[PDB]
Design an enzyme around this catalytic site. Structure first.
Site, PDB file in Angstrom:
ATOM      1  N   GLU A 243       0.770  -1.237   0.000  1.00 37.43           N
ATOM      2  CA  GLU A 243       0.000   0.000   0.000  1.00 37.43           C
ATOM      3  C   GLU A 243       0.798   1.282   0.000  1.00 37.43           C
ATOM      4  OE1 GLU A 243      -2.723   0.596  -0.764  1.00 37.43           O
ATOM      5  OE2 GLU A 243      -3.833  -1.272  -0.423  1.00 37.43           O
ATOM      6  N   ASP A 244       1.789   1.417  -0.865  1.00 40.39           N
ATOM      7  CA  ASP A 244       2.551   2.658  -0.933  1.00 40.39           C
ATOM      8  C   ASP A 244       3.331   3.001   0.308  1.00 40.39           C
ATOM      9  OD1 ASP A 244       1.160   2.791  -3.312  1.00 40.39           O
ATOM     10  OD2 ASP A 244       0.048   4.659  -2.731  1.00 40.39           O
ATOM     11  N   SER A 245       4.178   2.084   0.781  1.00 42.28           N
ATOM     12  CA  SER A 245       5.226   2.411   1.750  1.00 42.28           C
ATOM     13  C   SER A 245       6.461   1.834   1.132  1.00 42.28           C
ATOM     14  CB  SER A 245       5.028   1.801   3.086  1.00 42.28           C
ATOM     15  OG  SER A 245       4.933   0.437   2.857  1.00 42.28           O
TER      16      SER A 245
ATOM     17  N   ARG B 215      -1.665   2.228 -11.596  1.00 43.99           N
ATOM     18  CA  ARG B 215      -1.402   3.616 -11.822  1.00 43.99           C
ATOM     19  C   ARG B 215      -0.794   3.772 -13.216  1.00 43.99           C
ATOM     20  NH1 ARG B 215      -0.059   3.440  -6.029  1.00 43.99           N
ATOM     21  NH2 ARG B 215      -1.217   5.110  -4.934  1.00 43.99           N
TER      22      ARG B 215
END
Ligand code: MG
Ligand code: MG
Ligand code: ZN
Ligand code: ZN
Ligand code: ZN
Ligand code: ZN
Ligand code: ZN
Lengths: 67, 49, 117, 275, 73, 46, 404, 49, 490, 51
Positions: free
Chosen positions: I155-157, I339
């Site tokens: 999750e975007d870390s 994305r």
RNA sequence: AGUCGC
């Protein structure tokens, strides 16, 4: 700024190769070969020296190294 | 400001090489605050005489 | 700031002890060893020395949380042989392999080489 | 015990800079943990306390302290004579647990001065200096060996400080890495199929894959196990490569023997009641 | 209770009363003490503009008009 | 006695340790950077 | 404590949690509750409230606490199921070809929680011990939770193939007596879908054991992931010469066919469809051609993906992104459009000064031929930014109105 | 004398407009600073088109 | 091309862009006029033309990538990215830190972040040359792997190489300047810079006045912290109006000295004393602080992938390859596909080839270079897998990872917004007097708002006692007497 | 109907897979600054006396 | 106020 001692990624000391490097560019412009002669095989050590900007030389020109 | 959907927010066709296509905030002011293109220049004005 | 002092990663705390042993009740003849202030370097090797042993039924280790220096080792053996003895023996055995490795290495360096020191 | 391997060693090639070798008849976890020891657990000497008297340079104080903290220290002389700050009885630092350096420089000339580790000096006897010509007018000279560059200075700038290096190891801070690099490889023909090549022809064969010397590429062997681990330990020069390996094996033995003694202490002192 | 523009330690007559601003409490150095009716300094308190707009000042429920020049603004 | 104050450019001590105006003598500047403490402060290299 | 976020769109956005003290300076959250808060960790702040009495601590523990916020009454399906990276690793893990040695199983067993302590017999005893993937998964599934079906990924067939006698095409997810019998797990089984495995645990065995089941599954699968790995590289974005020729050739067929429709319109040979005007008909017809072109070529790109591909594994697992993303990355970005229609003539009868006046042909007005891998030509690039802006603006405008 | 008007930085009416790289380094101003903005009570204030 | 030879000549001649306009070979075109021109995209297209499209052109583009504005030009291969992805980067690039002008050591800017070792990007756009971005870099070339490794990075870390942050990776210095004026101000009241004393002043917060110098303000090099009072200002105020021996002590003057409430640790960098425009003795004092990259600090590649540093591992546990070049960041593979920021991937492969060849790489968007296959081909000549992957070993158990991980250089930015500034908690603080409810910002050490919307949520929870606790007993509880005969409080 | 509250905290959030679903990891500074009001009983009195 | 964060 100045060259970081010891490449971030792996750990190999590298500040020692900076002054030798600028002399090579005045000589043999083959940046690949110049990096090679200094012994920076692996590319993380090579990006270290390859990407750096030596900002200190501009910074030295301010009159008051006293403050 | 704050409650009004509109077409002066959407990138317009004429902004080709005049104003950067993708450099406007991501907040509520999106598209209203634009950013000048790199080659863009702006006329300083002169007498018509 | 909330970051521990980095030496706290490996120094034992004055109110702690290095290993702790607790029985498991789910199955007969089994044990749970707690190794405090240790990491995968130690935990992983002891797992492999125990699995080499044919009397051991089960052996495994798990680091409960990455931010927290501690490992647990579960080992289970046959009723005829205490699981504690296998662990002690597994270390000694391992100590012996590394000692032989060190002697062979120094001797191999001692082989017709130059600039060895 | 009647199942312990025989872990054999072979040195391929050795220099003062790196040491490259192959280990056979051992387990991967052994091969692995030993690698984690070369990085983390070999102890070494590096600057740990910096006290700054004067800083008129074009650089902030902690920045000078940091770069100085990474300067490599010739610990060829056994760091074992020298203790840890915590075990050593003395208040704070001392000659038996610490090494003292002084740097004092100023730019009086109309020419840009470079400050380099050769200017940092050992109060301590020459068995623990900076890695700059203290041992080598090396017939293999590289017309420099300036070791490192702490900062640059122009006329009227000064830098005066003192620093106390300590023994510590890589698990606590990266300055104590004994390694410049630490290559590790095993099963280079991917026989065991521990990695799976899609379109296996696109991959280049390694420097040890030259077994089949054939383009047949990665023969399978299902009964196999891991064997024959290839190493290449490279030293930053703060410690002789051969010595790094040997000290690593000892540190791991000291560490294991201590766990065994602690475990013995579990039944010897306060007898276990597991039965 | 009229007798304390700031003395109010029931057990022993006050020596000094210190202000633990962040905890919002008035403390008495040589015992425990909490005699509170906390007000870190009502001039800091009006500064309840932040994420809300500020340099047109909707929170401006109070102009100052520099009275110390005049007789009274 | 804060009787230091390195100057705007002449870097001479101002010497002021009182209420007089902070004009550097000899040198016209009136920007006065303040000199370091004699105090010792340690930095761990980390 | 109860922990929450703003905006608090619905009751699941604010829930009770037990603190667990750690070093460094941020709130750590069990990855699986990311979705009901709709958080990421792309930088999002969260706020915590600590109740101050035993009555309110009791009221939170009993009412608001997270294992009790699982199946939402918002639409009687679970609020949270397995997400992200673990979900792709579960797909990869349950496939019928996965086998484990005694060491790897013991390591995974060691990470499980409710493990009885009895290593199951490996599905292969000889020539060497091997445990299959589904098998190890069966230790995680609670007491006797039992689903069916929920195979419905791309695989198998669009309903008639499996009736051709059931030749173990391996997709169908069958579990019985709480033991996984066959078939890969995915968004359809583990996701927040009404018919899912997580739904059956909650509904069958009660909330707490389900709570430990989420914990238990995420942890075991993530360790296996550590030996297995997962990645993405240009290797995932590349097909072959044959696919790429056929892609170009199919776009060449579509573009030539548009010119045929323009020629029919200019010749005035065309007639309007009933209920519409001639422009609307022309526009309806060219739009039908460019979309149909796009979908045919996308379906071609889907066909060419090798089974090893990392990119295909994320879409097929149902971790992130969709089939259409693969199309755009591999084959063609496709039509751009504002307010529904093709890019308006912002200039006098043109879209950009680069084009000639009156050029309805697909490129001057919208449609981009290239893929994100090939790069967009300058004009293609700008028209794409127009289509991307609609998406940025709509987010801001819609956010205010729903709020009210 | 009728009043004081703010000068835009590094325009021809600034002091900075003629100087080379050496004088500007000497004056303590960065040669790379774009200028073009006012200085008001010690704050850099830029006008927005 | 003869005009070009004069432009080369400019290195020692007076010939210039104005001369170029004087040849009449270039023109200026406003948006109204740009509507009526027939404008060729590039010399190439205007050349090949015969019956290809038209032949009536009147202008041509000096280079098509010029349509980008200043921040969009930093982002390399912007055309291989999904369009809004480019917009997030234009915000974040503007958000990153680095060195912002060279003479920054003597500027008293209210707040600054300076990076230690900025690098010029390995991959660049030709426009970046005109931004002097080679002179003032904003970030560092990371070695990056897109892997899942330990699930810390979902999750975007991102997982980070802690030894790399230790060997000095992305370290920054931070500066805040506090400023204070000695106003003569009032009629008879007066301000003085001087060291306060509990004998003769009003105020005296428990915070330590002992670090103040005899001048009334601290001095460079002294370590300061969360409760230190840095400048000692005092306000003589009562003159003596409370007629008659309102002496006792602490009666002459009130305290209002300036103290740390934003830089909860650091060193005093500089202390600067001067007099301001009004002619009052005036002060500015700067504190330098150093931020180590830590769990919670926020970073981004140049293609709009921001994510938080989710954990840091030793250089022992990072996965490693062949030589053992362990990655500094691992960004999670689930981030790319949805994305579609494919350009980020080209940059690794371009980056790998540039660093490895030793030549800096071009990534200016619009060219004929067909840049994906040909970069891949160069890389194979160097000896890697021709499309970038590498076989990385598991850092823990030393095992080999079943598949390959995609790894190589990418410029990364450490953004302004850093965890240590945002963290906040309140446990009974100051109270505002218009509402007798808690403060609003951290500037006044405030609580958080339990908003209309959060309230509504608790109703749906039916936790009424807790709703009652939060909207009442936890912030502002009050006791009033009301008359029974009439409902009025009075 | 919505006011500021006391006993409240805010930071950036980061993922932790080793965490149970209804646990939340919390920084030391927030744990030491936040308080809970326990009431003393005749048996846990000894533990509170320790605290 | 504006900038800005999600
Ligand atoms: Mg999300
Ligand atoms: Mg987010
Ligand atoms: Zn390196
Ligand atoms: Zn000592
Ligand atoms: Zn008292
Ligand atoms: Zn002077
Ligand atoms: Zn009444």
């Amino acid at each position: 700024m100045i060259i970081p001692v010891r490449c971030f990624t792996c750990g190999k000391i590298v500040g020692n190769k900076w002054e030798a490097y600028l002399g090579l560019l005045q000589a043999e412009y083959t940046e690949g070969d110049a990096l090679d002669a200094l012994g920076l095989k692996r590319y993380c050590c090579r990006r270290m020296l390859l990407a750096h900007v030596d900002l200190i030389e501009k910074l030295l020109n301010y009159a008051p190294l006293e403050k | 400001r704050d409650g009004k959907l509109a077409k002066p927010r959407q990138l317009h066709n004429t902004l080709w090489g005049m104003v950067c296509p993708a450099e406007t905030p991501e907040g509520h002011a999106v598209g209203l605050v634009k950013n000048l293109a790199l080659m863009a220049y702006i006329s300083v004005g002169s007498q018509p005489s | 700031m909330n970051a521990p002092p980095a030496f706290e990663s490996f120094l034992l705390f004055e109110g702690e002890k290095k290993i702790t042993i607790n029985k498991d009740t789910k199955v007969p003849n089994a044990c749970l060893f707690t190794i405090n202030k240790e990491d995968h370097t130690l935990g992983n090797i002891i797992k492999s020395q125990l699995l080499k042993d044919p009397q051991v039924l089960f052996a495994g280790y798990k680091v409960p949380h990455p931010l927290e220096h501690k490992i647990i080792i579960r080992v289970q053996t046959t009723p005829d042989y205490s699981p504690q003895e296998a662990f002690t023996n597994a270390i000694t055995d391992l100590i012996s392999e590394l000692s032989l490795l060190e002697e062979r290495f120094r001797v191999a360096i001692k082989d017709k080489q130059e600039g060895i020191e | 015990m009647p199942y312990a391997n025989q872990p054999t060693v072979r040195i391929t090639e050795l220099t003062d800079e790196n040491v490259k070798f192959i280990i056979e008849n051992t387990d991967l976890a052994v091969a692995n943990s030993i690698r984690r020891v070369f990085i983390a657990e070999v102890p070494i000497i590096a600057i740990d306390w910096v006290q700054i008297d004067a800083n008129s340079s074009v650089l902030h104080d902690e920045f000078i302290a940091h770069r100085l903290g990474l300067i490599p220290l010739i610990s060829d002389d056994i760091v074992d004579k020298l203790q840890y700050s915590r075990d050593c009885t003395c208040e704070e630092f001392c000659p038996e647990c610490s090494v003292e350096f002084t740097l004092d420089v100023r730019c009086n000339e109309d020419q840009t001065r470079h400050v380099t580790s050769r200017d940092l000096i050992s109060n301590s006897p020459r068995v623990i200096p900076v890695t700059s010509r203290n041992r080598d007018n090396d017939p293999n000279d590289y017309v420099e060996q300036d070791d490192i560059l702490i900062v640059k200075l122009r006329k009227g700038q000064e830098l005066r400080l003192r620093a106390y290096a300590k023994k510590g190891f890589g698990k606590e801070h990266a300055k104590w890495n004994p390694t410049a690099g630490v290559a590790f490889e095993y099963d280079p023909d991917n026989a065991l199929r521990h990695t799976v090549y899609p379109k296996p022809e696109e991959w280049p064969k390694s420097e040890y894959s030259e077994l089949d010397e054939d383009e047949s590429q990665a023969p399978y062997d299902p009964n196999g196990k891991p064997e024959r681990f290839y190493y290449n330990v490279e030293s930053c020069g703060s410690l002789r490569p051969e010595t790094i390996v040997l000290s690593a094996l000892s540190g791991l033995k000291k560490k294991l023997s201590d766990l065994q003694t602690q475990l013995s202490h579990e039944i010897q002192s306060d007898v276990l009641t597991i039965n | 209770l009229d007798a304390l523009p700031r003395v109010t330690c029931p057990n022993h007559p006050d020596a000094i009363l210190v202000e633990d601003y962040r905890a919002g409490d008035m403390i008495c150095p040589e015992c425990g003490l909490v005699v509170g009716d906390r007000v870190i300094d009502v001039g800091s308190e009006w500064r309840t503009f932040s994420n809300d707009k500020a340099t047109k000042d909707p929170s401006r429920v109070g102009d100052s008009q520099n009275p110390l020049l005049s007789d009274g603004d | 006695q804060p009787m230091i104050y390195i100057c705007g450019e002449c870097h001479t001590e101002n010497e002021i340790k009182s209420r007089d105006p902070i004009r550097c003598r000899e040198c016209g500047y009136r920007i006065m950077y303040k000199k370091r403490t004699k105090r010792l402060v340690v930095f761990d290299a980390r | 404590v109860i922990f929450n976020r703003q905006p608090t769109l619905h009751k699941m956005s604010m829930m009770g949690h037990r603190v667990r003290i750690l070093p460094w300076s941020t709130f750590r959250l069990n990855l699986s509750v990311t979705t009901p808060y709709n958080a990421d960790f792309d930088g999002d702040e969260m706020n915590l409230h600590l109740p101050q009495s035993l009555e309110t601590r009791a009221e939170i523990q009993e009412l608001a606490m997270v294992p009790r916020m699982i199946v939402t009454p918002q639409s009687n399906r679970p609020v949270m199921g397995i997400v992200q990276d673990t979900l792709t690793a579960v797909r990869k893990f349950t496939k019928r070809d996965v086998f484990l040695e005694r060491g790897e199983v013991m390591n995974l067993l060691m990470f499980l929680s409710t493990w009885d302590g009895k290593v199951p017999q490996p599905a292969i005893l000889k020539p060497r011990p091997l445990w299959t993937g589904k098998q190890i998964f069966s230790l995680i599934i609670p007491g006797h939770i039992n689903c069916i079906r929920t195979h419905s990924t791309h695989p198998d067939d669009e309903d008639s193939g499996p009736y051709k006698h059931i030749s173990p095409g391996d997709t169908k997810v069958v579990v019985e007596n709480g033991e996984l019998i066959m078939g890969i797990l995915c968004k359809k089984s583990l996701g927040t879908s009404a018919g899912s495995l997580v739904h059956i645990s909650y509904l069958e065995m009660g909330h707490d054991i389900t709570r430990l089941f989420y914990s238990n599954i995420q942890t075991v699968i993530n360790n296996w992931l550590l030996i297995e790995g997962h990645t993405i590289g240009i290797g995932d974005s590349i097909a072959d010469s044959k696919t790429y020729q056929d892609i170009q050739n199919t776009i060449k067929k579509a573009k030539q066919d548009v010119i045929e429709v323009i020629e029919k319109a200019h010749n005035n040979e065309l007639e309007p469809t009933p209920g519409n005007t001639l422009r609307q008909t022309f526009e309806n017809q060219v739009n039908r051609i460019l979309n149909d072109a796009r979908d045919k070529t996308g379906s071609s790109a889907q066909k060419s993906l090798s089974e090893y591909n990392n990119f295909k594994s994320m879409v097929v697992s149902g971790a992130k992104g969709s089939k259409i993303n693969i199309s755009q990355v591999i084959a063609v970005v496709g039509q751009q459009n504002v307010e529904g229609k093709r890019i308006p003539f912002g200039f006098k009868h043109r879209t950009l000064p680069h084009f000639i006046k009156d050029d309805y042909g697909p490129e001057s007005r919208g449609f981009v031929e290239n893929s994100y891998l090939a790069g967009l030509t300058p004009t293609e690039f700008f028209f794409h930014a127009m289509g991307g802006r609609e998406g940025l603006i709509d987010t801001a405008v819609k956010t205010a109105e729903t709020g009210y | 004398f009728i009043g004081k008007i703010p000068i835009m930085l590094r325009s021809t009416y600034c002091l900075l407009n003629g100087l080379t790289d050496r004088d500007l380094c000497e004056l303590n101003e960065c040669p790379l600073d774009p200028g073009g903005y006012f200085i008001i009570n010690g704050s850099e204030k830029v006008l927005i088109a | 091309k003869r005009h070009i030879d004069q432009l080369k000549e400019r290195e020692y001649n007076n010939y210039s862009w104005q001369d170029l306009v004087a040849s009449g070979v270039v023109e200026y075109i406003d948006t109204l006029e740009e509507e009526t021109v027939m404008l060729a995209m590039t010399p190439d297209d205007l050349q090949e033309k015969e019956v290809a499209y038209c032949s009536t052109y009147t202008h041509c583009e000096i280079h098509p990538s010029m349509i980008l504005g200043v921040c969009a030009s930093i982002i390399p291969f912007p055309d291989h990215n999904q369009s809004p992805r480019n917009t997030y980067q234009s915000a974040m690039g503007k958000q990153a830190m680095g060195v912002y002008i060279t003479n920054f050591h003597v500027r008293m800017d209210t707040l600054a972040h300076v990076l230690y070792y900025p690098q010029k990007p390995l991959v660049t756009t030709r426009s970046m040359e005109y931004l002097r971005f080679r002179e003032l870099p904003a970030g560092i070339n990371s070695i990056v792997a897109i892997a899942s490794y330990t699930g810390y990075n979902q999750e975007d870390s991102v997982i980070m190489n802690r030894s790399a942050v230790d060997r000095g990776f992305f370290r920054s210095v931070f500066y805040r300047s506090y400023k204070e004026q000695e106003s003569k101000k009032g009629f008879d009241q007066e301000e003085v810079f001087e060291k306060p004393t509990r004998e003769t002043c009003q105020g005296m917060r428990h915070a330590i006045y002992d670090k103040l110098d005899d001048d009334g303000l601290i001095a460079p090099g002294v370590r300061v912290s969360g409760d230190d009072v840095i400048i000692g200002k005092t306000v003589t105020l009562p003159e003596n109006e409370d007629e008659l021996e309102s002496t006792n002590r602490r009666y002459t003057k009130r305290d209002c000295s300036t103290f740390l409430r934003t830089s909860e640790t650091g060193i005093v960098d500089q202390v600067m004393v001067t007099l301001n425009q009004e002619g009052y003795k005036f002060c500015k004092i700067r504190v330098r602080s150093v931020r180590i990259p830590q769990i919670g600090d926020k970073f981004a590649s140049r293609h709009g992938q921001k994510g938080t540093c989710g954990i840091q591992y030793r250089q022992e546990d990072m996965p490693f390859t062949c030589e053992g070049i362990t990655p500094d960041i691992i960004i999670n593979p689930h981030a790319i596909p949805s994305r579609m920021t494919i350009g980020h991937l080209i940059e690794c492969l371009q980056g790998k080839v540039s660093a490895n060849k030793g030549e800096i790489g071009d990534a200016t968007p619009f060219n004929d270079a067909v840049n994906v296959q040909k970069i891949s081909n160069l890389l194979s000549d160097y000896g890697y897998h021709l499309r970038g992957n590498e076989v990385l070993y598991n850092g823990f158990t030393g095992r080999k990872i079943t598949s390959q991980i995609f790894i190589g250089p990418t410029y990364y930015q450490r953004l302004k917004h850093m965890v240590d500034d945002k963290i906040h908690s309140r446990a009974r603080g100051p109270i505002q007097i218009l509402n007798r409810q808690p403060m609003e910002g951290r500037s006044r050490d405030g609580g958080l708002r339990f908003g209309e919307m959060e309230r509504d949520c608790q109703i749906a929870h039916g936790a009424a006692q807790f709703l009652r606790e939060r909207l009442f007993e936890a912030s502002d509880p009050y006791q009033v007497h009301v008359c029974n005969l009439c409902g009025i409080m009075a | 109907m919505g006011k500021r509250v006391d006993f409240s905290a805010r930071t950036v959030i980061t993922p932790d897979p080793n965490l149970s679903i209804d646990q939340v990891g919390v920084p030391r500074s927030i744990a030491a600054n936040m308080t809970f009001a326990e009431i003393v009983t005749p048996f846990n009195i000894d533990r509170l006396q320790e605290l």
